[PDB]
Amino acid sequence: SGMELSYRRSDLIFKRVLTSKPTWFVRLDIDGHGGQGEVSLIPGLSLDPEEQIGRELDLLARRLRAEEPIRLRQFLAERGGADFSDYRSVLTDIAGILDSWQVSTDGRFPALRFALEMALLDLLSGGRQEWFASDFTRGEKRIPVNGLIWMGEAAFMQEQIEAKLAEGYGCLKLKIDFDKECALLAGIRESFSPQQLEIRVDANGAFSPANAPQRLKRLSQFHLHSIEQPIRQHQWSEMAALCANSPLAIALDEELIGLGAEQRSAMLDAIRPQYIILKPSLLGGFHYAGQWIELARERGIGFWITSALESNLGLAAIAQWTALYQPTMPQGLGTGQLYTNNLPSNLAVDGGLLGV
């Protein structure tokens, strides 16, 4: 009568007691073809309650076995071509199916929503892990990506930077106690100019509405591209003042999580950020991340896409989607051997460009 949803929990173990991150691999099978997706959680950040993912998957499997997949079959047939269909339209149809399957219809299980969206995209195109086909998947185009660096001793930081530049990166992300950090940034700028090296810093809500203004003035003198989420989310009024007075561009990240429908435009209208950073697994998928992009475009707000610790399966899907926007600025993607048990992949980074 129905179809089959199967899954396996296989937490990704962080490379060296061992620690791991909750992750499930999901598969949809119907009429001889299958599609794969990944449920990726970041405890303390992702909205999805870890202890309920399993039951949500079991409840969906039961539902899918009990009903005739009439709407899904029509979707697979109608969008089978795709040459004659935009990905925005495909994602809209998928959202309709996910809604009918009662998947995160209240936005409480974004990672699950994303995993199932991934599975349907893969199912539609053949189960070849070609969520979004393009010059990228054919290896005819690459995506510019930024590298990472970590705050440490002056000479080691000089060493990491030298490493990345030799590796081809032109943009590096650094997570940012403050006085030491500024001095280090000053140190960096004496050896590396902005034209030669672009630096984005990430505060992860570390600053307070009090010390933020002065600190943003202080950091703006190092010619940085932008600072990510200066203060903790849910402080629209304070953030709007920071984005209005800061000579350093501000990019929102955590601020987008949990916002839905009209709440999204309301937040953008109120804060008027210079940039927003899209992390699909935290937002509920490509359909929703795509809507965020259109909201930003409508208001002249910049944006870039980044990974959120997913395995190489999720990373591939996100890179394939990102490639559709033909980005000119560095994106937060790229292989990052962080786990001991990641999935084998054909993704590679060289010259600061991500390709297959």
GROMACS .gro file of C-alpha atoms in nm:
model
  356
    1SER     CA    1   0.000   0.000   0.000
    2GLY     CA    2   0.258   0.256   0.110
    3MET     CA    3   0.631   0.315   0.101
    4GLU     CA    4   0.924   0.256   0.332
    5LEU     CA    5   1.118   0.490   0.557
    6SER     CA    6   1.431   0.337   0.713
    7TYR     CA    7   1.698   0.496   0.931
    8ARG     CA    8   2.006   0.428   1.139
    9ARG     CA    9   2.149   0.637   1.419
   10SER     CA   10   2.523   0.671   1.373
   11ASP     CA   11   2.656   0.959   1.581
   12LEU     CA   12   2.966   1.126   1.438
   13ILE     CA   13   3.260   1.091   1.675
   14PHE     CA   14   3.490   1.389   1.715
   15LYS     CA   15   3.853   1.319   1.637
   16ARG     CA   16   4.093   1.303   1.931
   17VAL     CA   17   3.704   0.991   2.663
   18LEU     CA   18   3.544   1.029   2.319
   19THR     CA   19   3.272   1.277   2.232
   20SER     CA   20   3.015   1.270   1.954
   21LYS     CA   21   2.732   1.455   1.782
   22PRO     CA   22   2.380   1.313   1.729
   23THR     CA   23   2.317   1.211   1.371
   24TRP     CA   24   2.077   0.981   1.191
   25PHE     CA   25   2.085   0.861   0.834
   26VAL     CA   26   1.744   0.833   0.673
   27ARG     CA   27   1.627   0.664   0.354
   28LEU     CA   28   1.300   0.674   0.160
   29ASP     CA   29   1.218   0.387  -0.078
   30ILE     CA   30   0.934   0.371  -0.329
   31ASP     CA   31   0.877   0.199  -0.662
   32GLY     CA   32   1.231   0.061  -0.683
   33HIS     CA   33   1.420   0.382  -0.610
   34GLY     CA   34   1.556   0.541  -0.295
   35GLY     CA   35   1.672   0.872  -0.155
   36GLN     CA   36   1.901   0.959   0.138
   37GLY     CA   37   1.899   1.234   0.401
   38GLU     CA   38   2.080   1.322   0.724
   39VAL     CA   39   1.939   1.435   1.059
   40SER     CA   40   2.215   1.646   1.215
   41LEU     CA   41   2.191   1.793   1.564
   42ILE     CA   42   2.419   2.031   1.747
   43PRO     CA   43   2.328   1.999   2.114
   44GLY     CA   44   2.271   2.341   2.270
   45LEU     CA   45   2.203   2.500   1.931
   46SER     CA   46   1.964   2.285   1.723
   47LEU     CA   47   1.596   2.320   1.819
   48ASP     CA   48   1.515   1.950   1.773
   49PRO     CA   49   1.485   1.758   2.102
   50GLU     CA   50   1.749   1.485   2.070
   51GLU     CA   51   1.550   1.238   2.279
   52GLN     CA   52   1.253   1.257   2.041
   53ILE     CA   53   1.412   1.221   1.699
   54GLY     CA   54   1.389   0.843   1.712
   55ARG     CA   55   1.017   0.842   1.790
   56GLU     CA   56   0.947   1.104   1.528
   57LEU     CA   57   1.117   0.879   1.272
   58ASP     CA   58   0.924   0.574   1.393
   59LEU     CA   59   0.595   0.765   1.380
   60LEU     CA   60   0.667   0.876   1.023
   61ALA     CA   61   0.762   0.525   0.914
   62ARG     CA   62   0.428   0.402   1.047
   63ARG     CA   63   0.239   0.678   0.868
   64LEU     CA   64   0.416   0.620   0.537
   65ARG     CA   65   0.346   0.247   0.545
   66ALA     CA   66  -0.023   0.309   0.606
   67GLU     CA   67  -0.110   0.543   0.318
   68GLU     CA   68  -0.095   0.525  -0.060
   69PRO     CA   69   0.179   0.769  -0.169
   70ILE     CA   70  -0.044   0.929  -0.429
   71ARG     CA   71   0.086   1.284  -0.393
   72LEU     CA   72   0.449   1.171  -0.382
   73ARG     CA   73   0.410   0.962  -0.695
   74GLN     CA   74   0.260   1.258  -0.879
   75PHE     CA   75   0.548   1.476  -0.761
   76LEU     CA   76   0.810   1.227  -0.881
   77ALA     CA   77   0.647   1.202  -1.222
   78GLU     CA   78   0.577   1.575  -1.273
   79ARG     CA   79   0.922   1.691  -1.164
   80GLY     CA   80   1.112   1.400  -1.315
   81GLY     CA   81   1.239   1.623  -1.593
   82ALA     CA   82   1.361   1.921  -1.388
   83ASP     CA   83   1.518   2.085  -1.694
   84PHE     CA   84   1.170   2.230  -1.728
   85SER     CA   85   1.141   2.303  -1.353
   86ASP     CA   86   1.315   2.541  -1.111
   87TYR     CA   87   1.461   2.412  -0.788
   88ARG     CA   88   1.258   2.668  -0.594
   89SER     CA   89   0.944   2.507  -0.736
   90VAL     CA   90   1.072   2.159  -0.658
   91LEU     CA   91   1.147   2.261  -0.301
   92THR     CA   92   0.801   2.412  -0.270
   93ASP     CA   93   0.641   2.085  -0.380
   94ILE     CA   94   0.858   1.895  -0.137
   95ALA     CA   95   0.749   2.125   0.147
   96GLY     CA   96   0.391   2.041   0.056
   97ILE     CA   97   0.462   1.671   0.091
   98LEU     CA   98   0.649   1.719   0.418
   99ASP     CA   99   0.355   1.920   0.549
  100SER     CA  100   0.119   1.638   0.453
  101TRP     CA  101   0.348   1.396   0.637
  102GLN     CA  102   0.323   1.623   0.941
  103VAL     CA  103   0.698   1.674   0.953
  104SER     CA  104   0.794   1.968   1.174
  105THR     CA  105   0.479   2.159   1.077
  106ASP     CA  106   0.529   2.384   1.380
  107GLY     CA  107   0.899   2.430   1.308
  108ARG     CA  108   1.006   2.234   1.619
  109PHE     CA  109   1.210   1.970   1.432
  110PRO     CA  110   1.416   2.162   1.173
  111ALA     CA  111   1.686   1.896   1.139
  112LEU     CA  112   1.426   1.630   1.073
  113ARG     CA  113   1.260   1.856   0.816
  114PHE     CA  114   1.597   1.901   0.644
  115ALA     CA  115   1.682   1.530   0.649
  116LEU     CA  116   1.353   1.437   0.482
  117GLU     CA  117   1.382   1.718   0.230
  118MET     CA  118   1.726   1.578   0.142
  119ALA     CA  119   1.581   1.229   0.104
  120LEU     CA  120   1.306   1.349  -0.130
  121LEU     CA  121   1.550   1.547  -0.344
  122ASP     CA  122   1.779   1.245  -0.377
  123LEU     CA  123   1.481   1.019  -0.449
  124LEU     CA  124   1.359   1.253  -0.725
  125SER     CA  125   1.691   1.251  -0.913
  126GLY     CA  126   1.775   0.883  -0.888
  127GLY     CA  127   1.938   0.805  -0.555
  128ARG     CA  128   2.282   0.902  -0.682
  129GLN     CA  129   2.338   1.171  -0.421
  130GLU     CA  130   2.267   1.442  -0.676
  131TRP     CA  131   2.034   1.657  -0.467
  132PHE     CA  132   2.086   1.951  -0.706
  133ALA     CA  133   2.251   1.889  -1.042
  134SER     CA  134   2.464   2.166  -1.192
  135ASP     CA  135   2.804   2.246  -1.335
  136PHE     CA  136   2.926   2.186  -0.980
  137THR     CA  137   2.817   1.823  -0.967
  138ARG     CA  138   2.967   1.774  -1.311
  139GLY     CA  139   3.297   1.912  -1.182
  140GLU     CA  140   3.284   2.207  -1.422
  141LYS     CA  141   3.257   2.473  -1.149
  142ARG     CA  142   3.387   2.521  -0.797
  143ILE     CA  143   3.279   2.716  -0.491
  144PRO     CA  144   3.504   2.972  -0.323
  145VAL     CA  145   3.541   2.886   0.045
  146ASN     CA  146   3.699   3.045   0.349
  147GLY     CA  147   3.945   2.874   0.579
  148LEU     CA  148   3.963   2.866   0.958
  149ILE     CA  149   4.226   2.987   1.205
  150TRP     CA  150   4.232   2.970   1.587
  151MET     CA  151   4.333   3.239   1.840
  152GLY     CA  152   4.675   3.140   1.976
  153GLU     CA  153   5.036   3.248   2.019
  154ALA     CA  154   5.149   3.520   1.776
  155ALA     CA  155   5.399   3.297   1.594
  156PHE     CA  156   5.166   2.997   1.559
  157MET     CA  157   4.889   3.221   1.428
  158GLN     CA  158   5.140   3.358   1.177
  159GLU     CA  159   5.217   2.995   1.093
  160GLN     CA  160   4.854   2.891   1.037
  161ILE     CA  161   4.797   3.196   0.817
  162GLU     CA  162   5.107   3.120   0.613
  163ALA     CA  163   4.974   2.766   0.578
  164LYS     CA  164   4.630   2.875   0.448
  165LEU     CA  165   4.772   3.131   0.206
  166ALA     CA  166   5.005   2.866   0.067
  167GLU     CA  167   4.693   2.646   0.045
  168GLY     CA  168   4.518   2.908  -0.166
  169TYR     CA  169   4.276   3.067   0.081
  170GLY     CA  170   4.219   3.440   0.059
  171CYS     CA  171   3.959   3.459   0.334
  172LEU     CA  172   3.989   3.323   0.688
  173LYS     CA  173   3.743   3.295   0.974
  174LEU     CA  174   3.854   3.352   1.332
  175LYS     CA  175   3.643   3.305   1.645
  176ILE     CA  176   3.686   3.577   1.908
  177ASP     CA  177   4.024   3.826   2.686
  178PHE     CA  178   3.962   4.105   2.429
  179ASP     CA  179   4.279   4.310   2.475
  180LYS     CA  180   4.490   4.004   2.398
  181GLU     CA  181   4.274   3.942   2.090
  182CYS     CA  182   4.300   4.297   1.956
  183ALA     CA  183   4.678   4.298   2.001
  184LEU     CA  184   4.691   3.968   1.813
  185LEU     CA  185   4.477   4.113   1.535
  186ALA     CA  186   4.713   4.412   1.522
  187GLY     CA  187   4.997   4.162   1.499
  188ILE     CA  188   4.827   3.983   1.213
  189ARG     CA  189   4.774   4.306   1.020
  190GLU     CA  190   5.142   4.406   1.034
  191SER     CA  191   5.231   4.096   0.834
  192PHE     CA  192   4.913   4.053   0.629
  193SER     CA  193   4.725   4.336   0.455
  194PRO     CA  194   4.350   4.319   0.390
  195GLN     CA  195   4.396   4.296   0.014
  196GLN     CA  196   4.619   3.993   0.071
  197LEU     CA  197   4.402   3.848   0.349
  198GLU     CA  198   4.033   3.889   0.425
  199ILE     CA  199   3.930   3.823   0.783
  200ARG     CA  200   3.583   3.752   0.921
  201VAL     CA  201   3.554   3.724   1.298
  202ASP     CA  202   3.291   3.530   1.489
  203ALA     CA  203   3.179   3.642   1.833
  204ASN     CA  204   2.895   3.395   1.890
  205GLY     CA  205   2.701   3.637   2.111
  206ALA     CA  206   3.005   3.686   2.335
  207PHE     CA  207   2.979   4.065   2.362
  208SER     CA  208   2.724   4.241   2.582
  209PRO     CA  209   2.504   4.528   2.464
  210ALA     CA  210   2.725   4.739   2.692
  211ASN     CA  211   3.079   4.671   2.570
  212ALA     CA  212   2.971   4.590   2.212
  213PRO     CA  213   2.972   4.943   2.060
  214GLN     CA  214   3.317   5.034   2.183
  215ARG     CA  215   3.449   4.688   2.090
  216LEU     CA  216   3.306   4.719   1.736
  217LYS     CA  217   3.485   5.052   1.700
  218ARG     CA  218   3.803   4.888   1.829
  219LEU     CA  219   3.777   4.597   1.585
  220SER     CA  220   3.683   4.810   1.285
  221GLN     CA  221   4.042   4.937   1.278
  222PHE     CA  222   4.173   4.602   1.162
  223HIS     CA  223   3.984   4.620   0.835
  224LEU     CA  224   3.772   4.309   0.889
  225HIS     CA  225   3.504   4.188   0.650
  226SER     CA  226   3.243   4.141   0.921
  227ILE     CA  227   3.169   4.026   1.272
  228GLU     CA  228   2.922   3.744   1.329
  229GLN     CA  229   2.648   3.764   1.596
  230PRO     CA  230   2.818   4.019   1.830
  231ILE     CA  231   2.564   3.982   2.108
  232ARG     CA  232   2.326   3.700   2.207
  233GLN     CA  233   2.013   3.654   1.997
  234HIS     CA  234   1.666   3.775   2.097
  235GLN     CA  235   1.787   4.131   2.159
  236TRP     CA  236   1.654   4.300   1.844
  237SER     CA  237   1.659   4.655   1.976
  238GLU     CA  238   2.016   4.630   2.098
  239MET     CA  239   2.129   4.460   1.778
  240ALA     CA  240   1.956   4.717   1.557
  241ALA     CA  241   2.151   4.992   1.734
  242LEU     CA  242   2.473   4.800   1.684
  243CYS     CA  243   2.405   4.754   1.313
  244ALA     CA  244   2.315   5.122   1.281
  245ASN     CA  245   2.626   5.267   1.448
  246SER     CA  246   2.899   5.010   1.386
  247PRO     CA  247   3.161   5.087   1.121
  248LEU     CA  248   3.212   4.708   1.109
  249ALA     CA  249   2.950   4.513   0.911
  250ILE     CA  250   2.740   4.273   1.113
  251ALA     CA  251   2.629   3.926   1.004
  252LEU     CA  252   2.349   3.746   1.188
  253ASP     CA  253   2.356   3.369   1.243
  254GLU     CA  254   2.185   3.242   1.558
  255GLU     CA  255   1.932   3.526   1.528
  256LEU     CA  256   1.748   3.342   1.246
  257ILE     CA  257   1.687   3.019   1.438
  258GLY     CA  258   1.326   2.949   1.533
  259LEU     CA  259   1.183   3.245   1.340
  260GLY     CA  260   0.898   3.166   1.105
  261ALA     CA  261   0.666   3.326   0.853
  262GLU     CA  262   0.621   3.698   0.925
  263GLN     CA  263   0.869   3.680   1.215
  264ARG     CA  264   1.148   3.654   0.960
  265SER     CA  265   1.075   3.978   0.777
  266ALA     CA  266   1.002   4.148   1.110
  267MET     CA  267   1.349   4.061   1.237
  268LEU     CA  268   1.521   4.184   0.919
  269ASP     CA  269   1.314   4.503   0.909
  270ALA     CA  270   1.394   4.575   1.273
  271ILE     CA  271   1.766   4.500   1.279
  272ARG     CA  272   1.863   4.583   0.921
  273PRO     CA  273   2.182   4.371   0.935
  274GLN     CA  274   2.451   4.396   0.668
  275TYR     CA  275   2.454   4.018   0.627
  276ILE     CA  276   2.278   3.698   0.732
  277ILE     CA  277   2.443   3.355   0.735
  278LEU     CA  278   2.237   3.058   0.617
  279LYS     CA  279   2.286   2.717   0.783
  280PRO     CA  280   2.017   2.489   0.628
  281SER     CA  281   2.013   2.218   0.895
  282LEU     CA  282   1.939   2.475   1.166
  283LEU     CA  283   1.675   2.652   0.959
  284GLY     CA  284   1.476   2.352   0.847
  285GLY     CA  285   1.622   2.304   0.502
  286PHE     CA  286   1.679   2.449   0.158
  287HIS     CA  287   1.320   2.558   0.101
  288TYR     CA  288   1.330   2.773   0.413
  289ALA     CA  289   1.691   2.886   0.365
  290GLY     CA  290   1.596   2.985   0.013
  291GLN     CA  291   1.308   3.194   0.143
  292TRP     CA  292   1.547   3.367   0.383
  293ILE     CA  293   1.770   3.453   0.086
  294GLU     CA  294   1.483   3.610  -0.104
  295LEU     CA  295   1.389   3.811   0.204
  296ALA     CA  296   1.746   3.938   0.227
  297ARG     CA  297   1.768   4.012  -0.145
  298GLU     CA  298   1.444   4.212  -0.126
  299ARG     CA  299   1.603   4.435   0.138
  300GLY     CA  300   1.954   4.462  -0.002
  301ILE     CA  301   2.098   4.243   0.273
  302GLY     CA  302   2.401   4.030   0.187
  303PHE     CA  303   2.439   3.663   0.266
  304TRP     CA  304   2.646   3.348   0.244
  305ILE     CA  305   2.587   2.983   0.323
  306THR     CA  306   2.774   2.770   0.572
  307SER     CA  307   2.789   2.417   0.703
  308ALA     CA  308   2.679   2.325   1.054
  309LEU     CA  309   2.895   2.025   1.138
  310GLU     CA  310   2.706   1.780   0.915
  311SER     CA  311   2.870   1.464   0.781
  312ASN     CA  312   2.994   1.461   0.423
  313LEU     CA  313   2.643   1.360   0.311
  314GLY     CA  314   2.486   1.679   0.440
  315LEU     CA  315   2.790   1.878   0.333
  316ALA     CA  316   2.755   1.755  -0.026
  317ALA     CA  317   2.386   1.845  -0.034
  318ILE     CA  318   2.453   2.193   0.102
  319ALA     CA  319   2.738   2.252  -0.140
  320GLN     CA  320   2.526   2.143  -0.434
  321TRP     CA  321   2.253   2.385  -0.327
  322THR     CA  322   2.498   2.667  -0.264
  323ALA     CA  323   2.642   2.624  -0.613
  324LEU     CA  324   2.303   2.717  -0.760
  325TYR     CA  325   2.344   3.071  -0.629
  326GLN     CA  326   2.675   3.107  -0.813
  327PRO     CA  327   2.852   3.272  -0.516
  328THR     CA  328   3.136   3.515  -0.574
  329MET     CA  329   3.218   3.561  -0.208
  330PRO     CA  330   3.367   3.283   0.008
  331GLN     CA  331   3.115   3.038   0.154
  332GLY     CA  332   3.145   2.851   0.484
  333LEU     CA  333   3.185   2.509   0.324
  334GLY     CA  334   3.470   2.272   0.250
  335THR     CA  335   3.597   1.941   0.381
  336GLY     CA  336   3.696   1.941   0.745
  337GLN     CA  337   3.823   1.615   0.887
  338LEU     CA  338   3.649   1.660   1.223
  339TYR     CA  339   3.526   1.305   1.275
  340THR     CA  340   3.670   0.956   1.305
  341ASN     CA  341   3.376   0.799   1.124
  342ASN     CA  342   3.263   1.040   0.852
  343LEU     CA  343   3.120   0.912   0.524
  344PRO     CA  344   3.356   0.863   0.231
  345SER     CA  345   3.308   1.149  -0.015
  346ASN     CA  346   3.442   1.289  -0.340
  347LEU     CA  347   3.450   1.645  -0.208
  348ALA     CA  348   3.787   1.821  -0.211
  349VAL     CA  349   3.926   2.167  -0.138
  350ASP     CA  350   4.231   2.310  -0.316
  351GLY     CA  351   4.320   2.669  -0.398
  352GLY     CA  352   4.040   2.786  -0.169
  353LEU     CA  353   3.778   2.635  -0.399
  354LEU     CA  354   3.544   2.346  -0.321
  355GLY     CA  355   3.473   2.093  -0.594
  356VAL     CA  356   3.399   1.726  -0.666
   0.00000   0.00000   0.00000
